[PDB]
Nucleic acid binder design. Structure first.
Ligand SMILES: [Mg+2]
Ligand SMILES: [Mg+2]
Ligand SMILES: [Mg+2]
Ligand SMILES: [Zn+2]
Ligand SMILES: [Zn+2]
Lengths: 1332, 145, 156
RNA sequence: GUUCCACUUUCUUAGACUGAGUUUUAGAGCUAGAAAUAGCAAGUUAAAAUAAGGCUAGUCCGUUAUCAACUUGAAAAAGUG
DNA sequence: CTAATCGCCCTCAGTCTAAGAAAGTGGAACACGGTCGGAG
DNA sequence: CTCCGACCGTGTTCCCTTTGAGGGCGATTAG
């Protein structure tokens, strides 16, 4: 009888119900409540709207930051607990004064000076040590006994900001010299290779190696200064090692095994040990020197000072910064006094200017301050050095800056240990507790352990070896690191879908590779002269090939198959292989790896050690911490030798397969008693496939599997954006309510369409360009500085991505001639609807691309290949573009299928007598192009800004087109309907055709052909007309599928229906309590205390909280000096922070708020977007407790919508000029439509919007611009619609006139309106007359 | 002048001439762009040919003059509703419109007895015009038979 | 000799002659009393006449040889199935029977798309014989079109 | 569409971290002028908090998802036109 | 002493490890009812 | 001459083609 059309989007779900004749039923629905109306007629079409679903990212970030804060606090607490006893003797209340430093003096328990407790000592301290780094350096270098409070201050400052943990091991920073070390390296190298010495040659290694270029570029420059020295050579590899790259050393030492060294990797010492054992340890000092040189240069950017003078290069560099700041400030002050004293007040006093006062005391950044004083500086003379300092970014630098993240923790550890050694001679407890403090700074919870929970954390997985409290000192003993890593990995790995309770095997499992090799061999056929048909291989032959070829050669090539097997055993001079290309895809890599490590083939071949070996490979896969891999393998160290274990440690695998051990070799057929692997090894005459085994009705595997094989959980488990999952839930609920509306009869067809979800980057662009240019070595950034927001222009972004060069012609481009250049589609847009940069190119003229109908010609490839190579190495073009260029030189979607499956499983729940699904409802999935083309062809134009009706209209047209398509060509059901499919069309592509060079062209032609039955006359591209009958019927049955004389009229009636159920989903606001900004102290009741005792009038705090939902309160409040009981009815906003308190006891909350005699039964919860109707039909939605939104939809007649669409789009709709001219004459004939549309808008606004000023400004502005061309006027009339649009009022520009939004700053009228409670479809309403 | 009645009376004159020739008074005139391209009269008996109708002769003369089997944008006037064979020939000729006079529920395949031009199985649609001088054609047929 | 297969084979010979002339290979022969009365093949394109079908040619030749537009009791053999035009001409000729080979159920005028020969309002009923040498007829047509899956679908 | 293997690019989820930013407090401002009014000298740092808080008392959790109205129903769930 | 308007405002940057899915390239499936070739 | 046994293609349209936002908030305006 009826079908349902659905349009599923990220912010909208359109729905419609149509009948056999494409009519939408109109039904009378009962209206509940205490109101006048008892019923309303409604059309069965509408659309649900809802705000986008958000990802869990921000919550994760917040949570991790919280954990960081608490752990830092615990660090400080540890320190104080260590210092407590010895501090109590020196100062009774030091820590107390420290912890109460935030309190105002009136609130303080002790005196206001934290460190010493009086003015004189505090001023003395600050006079002797202006910064903390002064105290640090004095405490490291001096030898005098120091005050315990200063020592504590230093240690705490180093512990509170420990620095990063990106470099492993320890550093030797005594060696600070780069020239002497490089000269020493060159020296020892020339010693070790007497035959060929390198010349020092006056290569300024410091500048080239410390320049701000990429590692690779610096390498290239380094070896460009060296004659006859290659980057792959020994010295080149050493330079690469010192630069932080990963070089391979195998080609230099004739080593068959890979020897890759990374100074940062914790395994460096062991890898180097193995390398030196292989090649001899007389080269160890050589690599040591390289390491020493790397050490001397690791921190050259930060320390900038020779490590000879002091043992605290960091604190010394800070003291340096301080002194230079001081001197240059004195100098600058003197200069401004002498030459521009009129601006002195502006520079050093006004906090709002970005001067020095704004820099130190205001919120001005170093960049803004520099830009501020650049002109002042350059306009003056005598500042020749100040500019030098400015370009170095070293003019007036502070010590706590954004760029201090480079500092590794090893240096703070060094200073800590130095201070500890210095002061352990005088305080015994520092000596006895030195190791504890060092372990406090050093220790870091491993990522594979996670939160140190005790059974109350949803996110934690760690297991406790004992029930102690965990500290940094007992962590290794209390936490079971091994089982914790095991859980860390096993909680994320996929289970086998066929056996959901079984874990998936490791990808490099020996069993898995046996399964794959046998699964490939099983389908290999052979024929000889005698036999009459090609035959499978038997068990014996397979065991022969494996034992003889697979177990002797690491890889087995096709040539080895032919010559060593086919030739030697079957005397075949030539043979064809079909499933693999030039080599067997499967291989026994682990078998040969192990054979090489254990050196005992008979150990590997013994079946009883298979599990053990699998467990070893499991361990090798499960862990990557060598110390833990070793601990796991320690049990088997006795079977062959210590060396085999040492070698087994280094072997590491990553990745997991697809199937479980029980699937491959666990299940046994009851009759046969043979596992899958047994049938793969030997199955006699039929060498049955794994797919066949799994699908063979004669065998019992399939049924034995079919044993093991919530809506919200099921939807949440899908992969995709949460927004679309929200839409999926909403559309399911809509479908349910629609079925309920239709008397629980199921629809005949459900046609679903889904909007393009790929569309739903300045920083990324700036990064891309910065890196590509730094690698390329171009100055164009220095010559033409850009900013991220400039890169939003496509032509400019392209220009910068190609280093200001032509992509086809090998010539420079002009940053001033982009308007003359062309953006060409690499693969023409007609074939691939790709609008991204991956398929777009900037060239001065598209003629230099070569042919127009294809990829750029072979000449352009030949001429530009090397340039494209350079762009690839510079990351200026991606891999996809390159690979497409290369092959070009050598010649619906998953989410919608998931939706269709969910719908089909919910709708068809019955099985026939043959235990097969009865498909009562056919789920059809269509792409957007069908309805888009249908609209363009038959002029069912769409303008999104007029109203939200198009969401429903699209669903209606989807249903219509889908039902028509399946009605006309039922054989295409396999393509368009979910479920039953057709295993064919693969052999059809093995025959010659008319044009099958591309699948895209085939799809194009296909869809352009199938949809012709909708048209009455076709115009081929020969000047040829083709006629079609008036009635379209299906040949085999004769049933009428289409009637050109009446179906269009019905469609037009449906599109023109004024009333459409557009329902905005009411949602309680969740998330952050308020804005995060911490405002200064202010006398205002809006300021919310940041802590219980922190009165915001004294301390400031938070502001502007978000209302979770309003609540209607009717009660009484005191009024006047005599406290008369007045009666009040008002809306009180319950903030998100107040929510829980209001729910726990609303009566107490309202009584505390000042309400009395609160009528509890009249409390109405009013979430956001609550709908209220007011007389004349004017409606308002609840935007907040103190603001409302527009609640009406302007139903513009379809004639005006189509006219507006055609008038706004002039430079489009290509083809024959005759139709374009007829549309031009239609515009000129119907120009009065503009005036009629503005009249309609004015009526609507005066009846509903009620903003006289904005309407008068619209009318005026339109009056002045009536002379201007119709196109412009039409576009700006389209702009005019945001005044009448649904939801929050917004500003808009009409003919350069900006109209600020008119907000609704009061909620009084809503308090006397009628509340409309709406169902999800809006068909059921409960209206409440709020008269009480 | 040049209206439906003009061509109807011209075909009636052709039918009267054919009747003077002792043949069936049925005529057909094929005009394209206000230019007469074909004229014919039913002389099946005078030629011993069952397919020698007025419509067939007119279509053949039009195809011979135009040197093409396609007669796009042609208009065929006839004093008698076309039969099934004549309707099929009009479909194959791809003519623009056919204007017939007196209806024939027994032999006219242009709506009276059946529909041929606008059948859902056809690959071409032809326009139909009726009701031009049906009484005179019926009287002439009754006088002849 | 003079059997149905013999005449269908002759019609196939004429359709092959039409194939030689690069025309749609359709042939027709009109027989009365085991005597040759008329033969024809499609010559539309080469003679610029949309009605120059095999059936039309055979009927006109029979009419000329017999000097009579009425072909009472005659049998018209045609390889392909006649179109609406040819079916109407057969009705107008008053022939006794039409024998065709392979069907074509996308334009057929003998029941598939519509029934015209045996229409209730006709003044003469023409008999229909189907499927003579259907396999050779359909193979000839498939070899001419060079587009498979049509003949097999029609036969099945 | 489902599914077995290889390559690349993107996204999602969870964990360990770092550097900043903001808010109060300590950095004895000086010289005439009772007062407004004005001149002169310094300015780089440090402590605490970083969602109010919660009990389960953990070196744990607190911004994701879900939610018209009524009725029967601890939760879940069902019915109402 | 109340409310309605007009502008102004809104925490951010980076590193590493692990797993999974999901697009573009490639290699291979997801069967059976007769039906023609020989036999004692 | 029925009984035993290895084998193979036809299935989509197609029967002369069309190629960033929106709610909070202080200062101003207004009765
Ligand atoms: Mg806290
Ligand atoms: Mg600071
Ligand atoms: Mg939420
Ligand atoms: Zn006729
Ligand atoms: Zn014909």
């Amino acid at each position: 009888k009826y079908s349902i059309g659905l349009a599923i989007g990220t912010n909208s779900v359109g729905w419609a119900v149509i009948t056999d004749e494409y009519k939408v039923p109109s039904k009378k629905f009962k209206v509940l409540g205490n109101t006048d109306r008892h019923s309303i007629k409604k059309n069965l079409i509408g659309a649900l709207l809802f705000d986008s679903g958000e990802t869990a990212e921000a919550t994760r970030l917040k949570r991790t930051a919280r954990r960081r804060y608490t752990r830092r606090k615990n660090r400080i607490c540890y320190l104080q607990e260590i210092f407590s006893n010895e501090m109590a003797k020196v100062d009774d209340s030091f820590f107390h004064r420290l912890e109460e430093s935030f309190l105002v003096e009136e609130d303080k328990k002790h005196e206001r000076h934290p460190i010493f407790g009086n003015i004189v000592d505090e001023v003395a301290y600050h006079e002797k040590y202006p910064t903390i780094y002064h105290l640090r350096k004095k405490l490291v270098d001096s030898t005098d006994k120091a005050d315990l409070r200063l020592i504590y201050l230093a240690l705490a400052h180093m512990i509170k900001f420990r620095g990063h943990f990106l470099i492993e091991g320890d550093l030797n920073p005594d060696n600070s010299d780069v020239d002497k070390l490089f000269i020493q390296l060159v020296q020892t190298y020339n010693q070790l290779f007497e035959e060929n010495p390198i010349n020092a040659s006056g290569v300024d290694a410091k500048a080239i190696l410390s320049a701000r270029l990429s590692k690779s570029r610096r390498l290239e420059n380094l070896i460009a200064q060296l004659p006859g020295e290659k980057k792959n050579g020994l010295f080149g590899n050493l330079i690469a090692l010192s630069l932080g790259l990963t070089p391979n050393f195998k080609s230099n030492f004739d080593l068959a095994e890979d020897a890759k060294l990374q100074l940062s990797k914790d395994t460096y010492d062991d890898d180097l040990d193995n390398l030196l054992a292989q090649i001899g340890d007389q080269y160890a000092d050589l690599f040591l020197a390289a390491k020493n040189l790397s050490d001397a240069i690791l921190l050259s950017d930060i320390l900038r000072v020779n490590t000879e003078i002091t043992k605290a290069p960091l604190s010394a560099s800070m003291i340096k910064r301080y002194d230079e700041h001081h001197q240059d400030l004195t100098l600058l002050k003197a200069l401004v006094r002498q030459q521009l004293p009129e601006k002195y007040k502006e520079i050093f006093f006004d906090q709002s200017k970005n001067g020095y006062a704004g820099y130190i005391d205001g919120g001005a950044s170093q960049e803004e301050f520099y830009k501020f004083i650049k002109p002042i500086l350059e306009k003056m003379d005598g500042t020749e050095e100040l500019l030098v300092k400015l370009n170095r970014e070293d003019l007036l630098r502070k010590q706590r800056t954004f760029d201090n993240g480079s500092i590794p923790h090893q240096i703070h550890l060094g200073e800590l240990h130095a201070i500890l050694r210095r002061q352990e001679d005088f305080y015994p407890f520092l000596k006895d507790n030195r190791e504890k403090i060092e372990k406090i700074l050093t220790f870091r919870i491993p990522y594979y352990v996670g939160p140190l929970a005790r059974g109350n954390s949803r996110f934690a997985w760690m297991t406790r070896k004992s029930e102690e409290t965990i500290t940094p000192w007992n962590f290794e003993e209390v936490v079971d690191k091994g089982a914790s890593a095991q859980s860390f990995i096993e909680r994320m790995t996929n289970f086998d879908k066929n056996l959901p309770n079984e874990k998936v095997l490791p990808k490099h499992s020996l069993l898995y590779e046996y399964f794959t090799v046998y699964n490939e061999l099983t389908k290999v056929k052979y024929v000889t002269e005698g036999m009459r048909k090609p035959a499978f291989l038997s068990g014996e032959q397979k065991k022969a090939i494996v034992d003889l070829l697979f177990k002797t050669n690491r890889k087995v090539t096709v040539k080895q198959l032919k010559e060593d097997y086919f030739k030697k055993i079957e005397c075949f001079d030539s043979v064809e292989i079909s499933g693999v290309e030039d080599r067997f895809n499967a291989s026994l890599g682990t078998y040969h790896d192990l054979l090489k490590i254990i050196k005992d083939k008979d150990f590997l071949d013994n079946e009883e050690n298979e599990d053990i070996l699998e467990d070893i490979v499991l361990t090798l896969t499960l862990f990557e911490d060598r110390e833990m891999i070793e601990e796991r393998l320690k049990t088997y160290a006795h079977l062959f030798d210590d060396k085999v274990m040492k070698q087994l440690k280094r072997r590491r695998y990553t990745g997991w397969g697809r199937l479980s051990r029980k699937l491959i070799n666990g299940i046994r057929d009851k009759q046969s008693g043979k596992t899958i692997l047994d049938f793969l090894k030997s199955d006699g005459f039929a060498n049955r496939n794994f797919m066949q085994l799994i699908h063979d009705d004669s065998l019992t595997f399939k049924e034995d599997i079919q044993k093991a094989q919530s809506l919200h959980e099921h939807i949440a488990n899908l992969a995709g954006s949460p927004a679309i999952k929200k839409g999926i839930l909403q559309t399911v609920k809509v479908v349910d309510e629609l079925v309920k509306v239709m008397g629980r009869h199921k629809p005949e067809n459900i046609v679903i369409e889904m909007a393009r979800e790929n569309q739903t980057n300045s920083r990324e662009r700036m990064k891309r360009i910065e890196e590509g240019i730094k690698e390329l070595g171009s100055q164009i950034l220095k010559e033409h500085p850009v900013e991220n927001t400039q890169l939003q222009n496509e032509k400019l972004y392209l220009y910068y991505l190609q280093n200001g060069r032509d992509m086809y012609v090998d010539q420079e481009l002009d940053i001033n001639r982009l308007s003359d250049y062309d953006v060409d589609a690499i693969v023409p847009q007609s074939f691939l609807k790709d609008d991204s940069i991956d398929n777009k190119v900037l060239t001065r003229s598209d003629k230099n691309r070569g042919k127009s109908d294809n990829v750029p010609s072979e000449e352009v490839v030949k001429k530009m290949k090397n340039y494209w190579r350079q762009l690839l190495n510079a990351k200026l073009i991606t891999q996809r573009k390159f690979d497409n260029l290369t092959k070009a030189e050598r010649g619906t979607r998953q989410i919608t299928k998931h939706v269709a499956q969910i719908l089909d499983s919910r709708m068809n729940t019955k099985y026939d007598e043959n235990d097969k699904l009865i498909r009562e409802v056919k789920v059809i999935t269509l792409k957007s192009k069908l309805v888009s083309d249908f609209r363009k062809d038959f002029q069912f134009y769409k303008v999104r800004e007029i109203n939200n009706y198009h969401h429903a209209h699209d669903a209606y047209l989807n249903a219509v087109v889908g039902t028509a398509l399946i009605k006309k060509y039922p054989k295409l059901e396999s393509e368009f309907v979910y479920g039953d499919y057709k295993v064919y069309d693969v052999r059809k592509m093995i025959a010659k055709s008319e044009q099958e060079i591309g699948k895209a062209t085939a799809k194009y032609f296909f869809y352009s052909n199938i949809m012709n039955f909708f048209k009455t006359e076709i115009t081929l591209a020969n000047g040829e007309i083709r006629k079609r009958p008036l009635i379209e019927t299906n040949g085999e049955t004769g049933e009428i599928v289409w009637d050109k004389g009446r179906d269009f009229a019905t469609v037009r009636k449906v599109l023109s229906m004024p009333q459409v159920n557009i329902v905005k989903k009411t949602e309680v606001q969740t998330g952050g309590f308020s804005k995060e900004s911490i405002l200064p102290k202010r006398n205002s009741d809006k300021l919310i205390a940041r802590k219980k005792d922190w009165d915001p009038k004294k301390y400031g705090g938070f502001d502007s909280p978000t209302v979770a939902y309003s609540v209607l309160v009717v009660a009484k409040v005191e009024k006047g000096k005599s406290k008369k009981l007045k009666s009040v009815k008002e809306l009180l906003g319950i903030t998100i922070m107040e929510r829980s308190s209001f729910e726990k006891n609303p009566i107490d909350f309202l009584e505390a708020k000042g309400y009395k005699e609160v009528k509890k039964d009249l409390i109405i919860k009013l979430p956001k977007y609550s709908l209220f109707e007011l007389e004349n039909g004017r409606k308002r939605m609840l935007a907040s407790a103190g603001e409302l939104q527009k609640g009406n939809e302007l139903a513009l007649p379809s004639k005006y919508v189509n006219f507006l669409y055609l008038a706004s789009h002039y430079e489009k709709l290509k083809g024959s000029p005759e139709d374009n001219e007829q549309k031009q004459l239609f515009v000129e004939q119907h120009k009065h439509y503009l005036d009629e549309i503005i009249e309609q808008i004015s009526e609507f606004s005066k009846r509903v919007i009620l903003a006289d000023a904005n309407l008068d400004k619209v009318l005026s502005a339109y009056n002045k611009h009536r002379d201007k061309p119709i196109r412009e006027q039409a576009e700006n009339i389209i702009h005019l619609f945001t005044l009448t649009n649904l939801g929050a009022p917004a500003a808009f520009k009409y003919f350069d006139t900006t109209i600020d939004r008119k907000r609704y700053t009061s909620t009084k009228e809503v308090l006397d309106a009628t509340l409309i409670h709406q169902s999800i479809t809006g068909l059921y309403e409960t209206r409440i007359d709020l008269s009480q | 002048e040049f209206s439906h009645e003009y061509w109807m009376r011209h075909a009636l004159t052709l039918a009267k001439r054919a009747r003077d020739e002792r043949e069936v008074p049925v005529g057909a005139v094929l005009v394209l762009n206000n230019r007469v391209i074909g004229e014919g009269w039913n002389r099946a008996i005078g030629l011993h040919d069952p397919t020698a109708h007025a419509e067939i002769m007119a279509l053949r003369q039009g195809g011979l003059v135009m040197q093409n089997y396609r007669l796009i944008d042609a208009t065929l006037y006839v004093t008698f509703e076309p039969c099934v064979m004549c309707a099929g020939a009009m479909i194959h000729s791809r003519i623009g419109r056919v204007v017939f006079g007196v209806r024939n529920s027994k032999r006219g395949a242009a709506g009276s007895l059946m529909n041929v031009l606008n059948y859902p199985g056809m690959n071409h649609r032809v326009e139909i015009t009726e009701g031009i001088l049906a009484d005179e054609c019926a009287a002439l047929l009754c006088d002849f038979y």
